[PDB]
């Protein structure tokens, strides 16, 4: 069987993402010196199912604005990628081995843009057209680092296959050899999935569930995908279930981390952001995706292809 396994991949992340939307409000309260939800249930745990059932009773917003065969796709497309964006992601053994999986992430991660464009082009609003377009060049100039920062790292790894990284992280984490990559990686995780200090879609009305469902979904992923690449947890194959249990807390730290950001800083004024990724990171970055290519050439040895 196999259906039984995706049954243990989707519902065990959709529950998770929902309790992020809660923990979001619970931390940031306590960041802001206040309890969050307490009366929806025991300790706010029952907020999301309530908020969920709220939106899915939303009275029929008049479907303006297009042949609605495109207002159907923008949410249904982006959420669809995210649930697929997890599949190769190898908790100790992946659901799906991919020899090029780390590269399968970017496309699926980057193809989601058409949700933000088509909702911007469908939405016959002279402002939101070029209001949901800043956010696209935003997401795109971000995408470069998301590859280079990912690429130059895998230079001193073997193939693109994510199963390798567990082996490469035997005695050591990739956090130390490239702490800069991780820095430029981390913002490149905030970068796409705007839920970050920079938002630029908060300064797509009726089916707000799906963006609200996919946005936070990619968070737990792209935090997780940072752990599995840099903050490598421990595999030690006779009790592989440990790895997942250590894979947990790093994903929660990296995700508790984001929430400390939004309750740390303000937005970023979309001209700096380019200036940040066309003067400061990318020129800094190429030297690193020139450094690691000389690295094994210099050092002694280059990793394999299994």
């Amino acid at each position: 069987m196999f259906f039984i396994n995706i049954l243990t991949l989707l519902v065990p992340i959709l529950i998770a993402m929902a309790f992020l939307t809660l923990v979001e409000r619970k931390i940031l309260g306590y960041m802001q010196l206040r309890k969050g939800p307490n009366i929806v249930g025991p300790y706010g745990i029952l907020q999301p199912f309530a908020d969920a059932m709220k939106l899915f009773m939303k009275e029929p917003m008049r479907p303006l604005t297009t042949s609605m065969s495109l207002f159907i796709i923008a949410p249904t497309l982006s959420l669809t990628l995210a649930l697929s964006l997890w599949v190769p992601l190898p908790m100790p053994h992946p659901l799906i081995n991919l020899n090029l999986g780390i590269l399968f992430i970017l496309a699926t991660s980057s193809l989601s843009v058409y949700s933000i464009l088509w909702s911007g082009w469908a939405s016959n609003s002279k402002y939101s057209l070029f209001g949901a377009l800043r956010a696209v060049a935003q997401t795109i100039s971000y995408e470069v680092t998301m590859a280079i920062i990912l690429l130059s790292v895998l230079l001193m790894n073997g193939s693109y296959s994510l199963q390798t990284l567990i082996t490469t992280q035997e005695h050591m984490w990739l956090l130390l050899p490239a702490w800069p990559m991780a820095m430029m990686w981390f913002i490149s995780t905030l970068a796409e999935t705007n839920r970050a200090p920079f938002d630029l879609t908060e300064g797509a009305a009726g089916p707000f569930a799906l963006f609200f469902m996919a946005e936070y979904t990619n968070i737990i992923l792209m935090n997780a995908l940072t752990t599995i690449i840099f903050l490598g947890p421990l595999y030690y194959i006779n009790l592989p279930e440990l790895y997942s249990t250590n894979f947990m807390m790093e994903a929660l730290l990296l995700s508790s981390t984001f929430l400390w950001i939004r309750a740390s800083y303000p937005r970023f004024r979309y001209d700096q952001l380019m200036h940040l990724l066309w003067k400061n990171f990318l020129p800094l970055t190429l030297a690193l995706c020139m450094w690691h290519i000389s690295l094994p050439i210099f050092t002694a040895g280059v990793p394999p292809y299994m």
Binding site: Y30, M31, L33, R34, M183, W260, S264, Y265
Partner: protein, 178 residues
């Protein structure tokens, strides 16, 4: 005394001792940590929230809220139609048409507040030379209708026939004080 908020720009011969400390304040980010690690303190602090209907907050006995017509300790409605508790009411909120009481005495036939007027300013509780009108600690009297706030007088007695157990202790700590 005038104080320059921001006057520190002076060419201090920026050397590698210090000029890189700014580069230590940069690429190896520290000021952002400094702004982050602060916030992390508060989540380990005591949130000052309170479970409102079970934990209501602090007031003081001079709180300006809902009105009420007091009464003497021996029946006898304390309001006597002076007609300066509207002449001062800046909202122009009030109409207190009056008559004799059929006892030969002097009282009202009318008394009014539009509580959607009535800024809750406090001129009337103090202008009343008798403390016949007062302004008591109720602030949960929101209703679903603009009409149920137009308190006439029978509500505004039987309200004053309710909190008199309370007002006569706040005012007990507020006479000899205004």
């Amino acid at each position: 005394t005038y104080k320059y908020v921001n006057k520190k720009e002076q060419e201090s011969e920026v050397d590698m001792k210090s000029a890189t400390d700014n580069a230590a304040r940069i690429l190896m980010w520290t000021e952002l940590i400094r702004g982050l690690g602060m916030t992390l303190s508060y989540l380990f602090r005591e949130p000052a929230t309170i479970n409102y209907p079970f934990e209501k907050g602090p007031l003081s006995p001079r709180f300006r809220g809902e009105h009420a017509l007091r009464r003497y300790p021996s029946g006898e409605e304390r309001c006597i139609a002076c007609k300066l508790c509207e002449a001062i009411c800046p909202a122009q909120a009030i109409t207190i048409e009056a008559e004799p009481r059929a006892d030969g005495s002097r009282r009202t036939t009318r008394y009014d507040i539009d509580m959607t007027k009535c800024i809750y300013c406090g001129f009337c509780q103090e202008a009343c030379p008798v403390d016949a009108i007062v302004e008591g600690p109720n602030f949960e009297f929101s209703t679903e209708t603009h009409e149920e706030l137009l308190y006439n007088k029978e509500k505004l007695l039987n309200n004053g026939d309710k909190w008199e157990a309370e007002i006569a202790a706040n005012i007990q700590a507020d006479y000899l004080y205004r």
